[PDB]
Write a protein that binds this ligand. Structure first.
Ligand code: FMC
Ligand code: FMC
Ligand code: FMC
Ligand code: FMC
Ligand code: FMC
Ligand code: FMC
Lengths: 237, 237, 237, 237, 237, 237
């Protein structure tokens, strides 16, 4: 057991899908995994392990924000033998050509957090996903006939940002989705020696104020899950 | 009625106690409140409203880290009429004279987060509690025969810090407890014109690695909750 | 003796009142202290030691700005056994409801100085007063029929700031008064393990230069000094 | 003509290979392009246009450092219709498993430059290559039977860095090569709306002090050129 | 009148000598100026105006630290028509070949203050003296048989710096003297379109507290004042 | 004998003039030196050594930007015994009274580069020229009947800045010319214990868009070179 996960080595697969919402983790386990078993509920942060097409897979929530997901991803990597983390999240769009439910793949993640500056002597660490995992997700999406854009996410510390003008800057620099975790997970993967990828579903448009409901995010973002799971199978080859 | 809280105005009291762990919110409601009812379960972040000695009180988890708790506190203040937030948590000590089970009140909170610099034009915002709430808590503790230390907390972005050296710095500058939320909550309170206070119990000593019993640790945790609840009654005057 | 104070251990009380204007020290000594003796004259920064209602008190100016007051407060603490510093001075207000002649107590002090970032590994140190000293001053003021406001000061490096927009930011975040010392004194207090408090009287509104008649200014100055001195007696407990 | 390029729209292909060394650009044109014509020599920064397997291609030096290459890439994008920039550079390795002449592909680029902070409101911009271009280079290398690692480069402002310890940090974070341009080119591509990729040949090992000669870098780094050119043909499909 | 100087336009010469120690102003006026009249006494910061060899000169102390001297120099320039400020003071040396009683002239001033970053959009402003004033002082010293060193001062915010390692960095980069004002005065001069120079006499080695006899210190002080005054006459040209 | 300079000790004079453009180095050697011979051609960065009025002098391009010129100047100083670097370049003016063809001497150089912060523990290093070289250049200009302005340059990382507002800031703080190298060269000189000076001719006015003739512009450029060469002869004394 670790301070935030009451489980033992072997309870998790070597690949873990991670939504921010533990209820989404529950939905994923019930809907996509066979013979799923709950392996953690410390702090209500539900985690499960089962199989997808014979392949051992885990899914567990990581909570909201870089500091929360940094705890869970670290513990999984250092104490549970986890080799790959695939965040399956939601995000808000700033670009005009992006619609609700669009799937975006974060090859990189910008951020206004200080965590990577703390790691990297106050320089610019380019928080990037593992290339093979990106390519696996792209290929899986194509086989599924699901459109997906690959590019930069922005990982915000403040969902309610006092700096509205920063969204103009994100838009200028082609940011595909604003979420709150990717850059931190990528920093953890590099620090602790594992691999990670974030895929998000657009659940809000920051300009139009169109948005999906909480229930929709919890139980209807199926495209990104299929992409994530099928991408794992590709990586195994 | 917000993306993270499925409740309506009136469902929350004008004061909310907030532990990090939603399971601990349920614990507090069951233990200390009469007629508590669940008012939120989005993302598993349980919230409850009941009464303490006839006074309407809410309790709801805030999740781990500044970004998580910043979402919930903002929404409570702007959308649910909440006037006071009291974070009730655990912290780690760095000072030799601060002991396991000491109760510490964060009149201020240092941080390595960038959120207040973003708010405050890259200058130093002193993230502080509301003075009247601090002295209500000090007085409630005194009435319960519990001494509480008042001073600075440090709100960390990284529970697993790569910078081992920062703990010596915290010790040098007299930090009473290390946690992950206070400076963010204080920043939200200032930004949105509300009042906040963080009280913590020392659950670990980053130095001594001291030991207590579960019974004693749980007693002190309950004492902290009683301090928080009684402090509200004093403020109501 | 120290580089800026020609005195020996014992020449200063364990509590020192510090105005910015060095001319105020002799005034305070003659008007409020009994049996005062001169204990410093280096650079014209006159210091005196006497008693107030039997209690040993010293008074000496600190000069304008963080670097000046940081020198005197450090030397007093490390070489003269001083345990408490009370800065007594003026501030300018940015809040429309904060009035000329209001007494404000800096529980915290924001700043645009780099001194605390230098101390605190470039993170956010919450520069705070000693809580008991704050409460003592609040209680002393109340007994004199004065309602003091407690909250954040802003300690500016530039009295003539080229950033006009910062005053609006200060206002938004509830800053009670703008002065030039508190954050520095609070930083020294934390660095060297002592206790400090800044009390200010509002002498100006930053944006509209209405002023106070000299007679009203002297009356309010005397009130502030009485609050400071009586607060010490309450602290002796 | 632009301030640093004496040519007109149409003189450059829509894809430009860019080594730092204009003499390497000359070598590339002579060795790999047919019917090459010199289209610029302002400041000795030689640029050429010819064909590779029937495909119009340009090659031009960009000079050393982010500020130098930022000028040339900008002008090409805004005034010469250039759509893709492929930097074909040299770099120094910090990882033990990396050898002289190894080819590395920079999907991302870390940096100690301030240029991206200036663009991105002092936040962390993840300076990333275009994904399709990365994938094209990976596929071309595989078809050529040439090994290539994909990951982060570090773009240094100081070839002679006074901070030797930063190399330990780069090594910890898996940096594949230290060069001086990638992060700046990626910033320009995003700012001015084009696509870019940096491929480098390891020409020095920062730990072992093994290094190739100036002449070798000028006229013998053929693997990376073949990869770059063949990757273009893949992208055209 | 201005907030810190009770005088009117014309009361000050267009050139003002400023010692840090306010007691030095009266000394300079009595010892070096003819027909001196008192022109300020606010906060005990005595100012005088007289003539030196027929030329109008004023002298007034500036207090310790950037924030203090920034107030006086700003008011003198904007409200009293002052064109040149010469700070005359002491510094501590870090270079082994810089000796006690050496005269040093700050052509530039490094700093750990944030004031110039606040002015200069967080970039590096090179805080510099007026070149002609520097050369005038060099020439005036030469005519008095004194060889002055010209180079960088370092203007510290903290006389008692917790960063001991910074003195070695200062030494490495050739800093001639450590004081507390020059960078601030130079910043004000640039902001308000005037000219400034800091001249210092070495009174200490930072690392080994050997000192100068009071008689030697007064002799060297007089030499510095004579250099300053004669430099003005050379500047009149 | 270095990766960027194929020459041996003795091939360079102890003073090197450096324009940005290697073709301009060749121009200077042909125009002003006797018996000039090429001593470097690596990366096309032409360098030459010849005599001026019997005095051995070298001239070599430094490329555009701080990172490029930092490589060449460091190597000249540490590997080729060079004692003095004189950058001879062009700059853009922001001040209305600074005119096309004015000669400006950079006694200091501001910058938006991070290189000096990296050197100087993240504080403000005032990047300055060698005082004696500045006054040699001023005197040489006077002897040629050319008035030269001495003050601050601004060394930009981005020739194409996204921050249009910085030019107003440069103007406000009195910057004489905008170029791309001086602060980097001055930082190198300080780091490695050598001496440097940047002289520029105003070739563009970022405001007026003034016009001159090519003949007149080229005359002034040659005057600047003569100032540089004659300044060396004065320093030799
Ligand atoms: N418009 C938006 N802005 C920032 N974060 C999110 C998210 C994700 O959902 C959570 C906040 O709702 C958090 O985990 C974040 O990554 N969905 N939509 C978002
Ligand atoms: N030694 C420590 N360091 C950082 N956070 C905590 C905590 C709290 O518990 C959570 C991390 O376990 C987080 O919400 C924080 O507030 N207890 N002890 C801590
Ligand atoms: N409106 C204002 N802005 C900045 N400082 C002050 C002060 C205090 O007075 C001094 C400036 O005159 C300085 O010591 C500061 O603490 N009073 N009113 C002020
Ligand atoms: N060990 C090293 N460190 C930094 N840059 C380089 C380079 C590249 O070559 C140039 C410096 O030699 C510059 O353009 C840079 O990108 N090769 N080897 C390098
Ligand atoms: N070794 C030293 N370190 C910092 N400042 C000074 C000074 C000057 O004297 C004052 C500090 O005593 C301050 O005004 C500064 O300019 N002399 N010697 C100094
Ligand atoms: N208005 C301007 N802005 C930036 N650099 C320059 C220059 C110089 O010329 C080069 C850029 O063209 C570079 O080396 C710089 O030093 N001339 N005019 C300039």
């Amino acid at each position: 057991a670790t301070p935030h996960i009451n489980a033992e080595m072997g309870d998790f697969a070597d690949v873990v899908l991670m939504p921010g919402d533990p209820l989404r983790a529950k939905y994923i386990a019930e809907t996509f995994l066979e013979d799923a078993r709950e392996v953690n509920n410390v702090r209500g942060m539900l985690g499960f392990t089962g199989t997808y097409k014979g392949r051992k897979i885990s899914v567990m929530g990581h909570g909201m924000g870089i500091p929360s997901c940094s705890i869970y991803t670290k513990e999984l990597i250092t104490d549970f033998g986890v080799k790959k983390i695939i965040r399956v999240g939601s995000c808000g769009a700033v670009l005009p050509h992006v619609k609700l439910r669009d799937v975006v793949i974060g090859m990189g993640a910008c951020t206004d957090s200080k965590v990577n500056r703390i790691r990297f002597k106050d320089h610019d660490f380019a928080a990037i996903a593992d290339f093979d995992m990106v390519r696996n997700a792209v290929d899986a999406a194509k086989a599924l006939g699901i459109d997906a854009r690959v590019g930069n996410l922005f990982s915000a510390d403040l969902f309610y940002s006092p700096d509205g003008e920063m969204f103009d800057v994100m838009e200028k620099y082609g940011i595909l989705g604003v979420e709150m975790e990717a850059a931190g997970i990528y920093g953890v993967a590099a620090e602790f020696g594992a691999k990670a990828l974030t895929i998000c579903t657009v659940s809000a448009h920051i300009r139009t104020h169109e948005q999906t409901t909480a229930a929709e995010a919890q139980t209807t973002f199926n495209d990104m899950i299929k992409i994530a799971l099928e991408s794992v199978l590709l990586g195994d080859k």
